[PDB]
């Protein structure tokens, strides 16, 4: 529930910020930049999964301008494309969740690559 | 985690924004502004509980700059005070979490009050 458009914009931005931080902690392990700790990786993946379900709920009508938004007009004019990019992300996060459950480093690394590609694919089309 | 101190600031601000939104949904039910739905209340309480564990991890040394911030210097120069305020909040959130699991309206409402008091108590001294 968002009382003004500014509230939706600040909410989605906030959720993306937290997603990026926790995802990046997992990515650092996967990329061989930090030691691997499966329990910590799982905890951060679980947070990414919970958070991933939030921002894309906050792109309602009239939330396209102001408040520092970087959402492109295509988010609303190509709503089906935006939903497809969101569904691609959700599917990738499902794989990341599965990987966190198994603890399998190779499966985590694969899911990190796939998930990262879903972030970039949506940004390329929908984010300034 | 935080590469730059600005990353900590943006992180804690972001967590607080999400906490306020989801807590506000529970509060609206406690105040009788929205019909009570124990399942939905429990979902929002669960999110508040998860999120509540995040922002207070992002007030490390040197994070009074690197991005715009409303954190008062006392966060760092009255660290015991800030910790007491954080612990009061965590205790209240613990009760909120328990209340969400019972689905008892009265227990949720009481924990909403205690939790909101903890938000305000910290802000009065530190924001
Ligand atoms: C579309 C389906 C997206 C997916 C998948 C991801 N992001 Fe994104 N992001 C998207 C938009 C339209 C915006 C702009 C939001 C606005 O209104 O301004 C963003 C923004 C971000 C940000 C910036 C937050 C800020 O500066 O306040 C970050 C850090 C970010 N996104 C990260 C991110 C990551 C790591 C993702 C995958 C794990 C990801 N996003 C997915 C659209 C979409
Ligand atoms: C101290 C122990 C705090 C408790 C408990 C709560 N908050 Fe707070 N909050 C605190 C600080 C020091 C700041 C400033 C952070 C900064 O670096 O700027 C905040 C900020 C907020 C915000 C604003 C976020 C923004 O505009 O980007 C909100 C919406 C907020 N806090 C809400 C909030 C709620 C609802 C709380 C209880 C459920 C709560 N905070 C607790 C310190 C503390």
- Quick one: overall form of chain A? elongated
Number of strands of chain A: 0
Largest interface: A-B, 15 and 17 residues
Number of helices of chain A: 5
According to CATH, the fold-level topology of chain A is Four Helix Bundle (Hemerythrin (Met), subunit A)
Report the C-alpha radius of gyration of chain A, rounded. 15 Å
Q: What small molecules does this complex bind?
A: heme C
- Sketch the major β-sheet of chain A: none
Order of secondary-structure elements of chain A: HHHHH
What's the name of the CATH homologous superfamily of chain A?
Cytochrome c/b562
- Structural class estimated from helices and strands of chain A: mainly alpha
Distance between the termini of chain A: 25 Å
Count the domains of chain A.
1
CATH C-level category of chain A: Mainly Alpha
Function (chain A): Cytochrome c' is the most widely occurring bacterial c-type cytochrome. Cytochromes c' are high-spin proteins and the heme has no sixth ligand. Their exact function is not known.
Binding site for heme c (chain A): 12-13, 69-70, 119, 122-123
Keywords (chain A): Electron transport, Heme, Iron, Metal-binding, Transport
GO molecular function (chain A): electron transfer activity; heme binding; iron ion binding
Structure overview:
The structure is a homodimer. The first copy, chain A, is mostly helical and about 130 residues long. Chain A has a single domain, classed as Up-down Bundle (Four Helix Bundle (Hemerythrin (Met), subunit A)), CATH 1.20.120.10. Chain A has five helices and no strands. In chain A, helix 1 packs antiparallel against helix 5 (about 105-125) and helix 2 (about 40-50) runs antiparallel to helix 4. The longest helix of chain A has 26 residues, at about 5-30. Chain A is elongated, with a radius of gyration of 15 Å. The structure holds heme C (HEC) (2 copies). The site of one heme C has 23 residues of chain A, from helix 1, helix 4 and helix 5.
């Amino acid at each position: 529930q968002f009382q003004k458009p500014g509230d939706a914009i600040e909410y989605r931005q906030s959720a993306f910020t937290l997603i990026a931080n926790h995802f990046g902690r997992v990515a650092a392990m996967a990329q061989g930049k930090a030691p691997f700790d499966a329990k910590v990786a799982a905890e951060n993946i679980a947070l990414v999964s919970t958070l991933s379900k939030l921002p894309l709920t906050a792109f309602g009508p009239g939330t396209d301008k102001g408040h520092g938004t970087e959402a492109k007009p295509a988010v609303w004019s190509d709503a089906a494309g935006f939903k497809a990019a969101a569904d691609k992300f959700a599917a990738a996060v499902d794989k990341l969740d599965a990987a966190g459950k198994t603890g399998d480093f190779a499966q985590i690394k694969a899911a990190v690559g796939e998930t990262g590609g879903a972030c970039k694919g949506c940004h390329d089309k929908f984010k300034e």
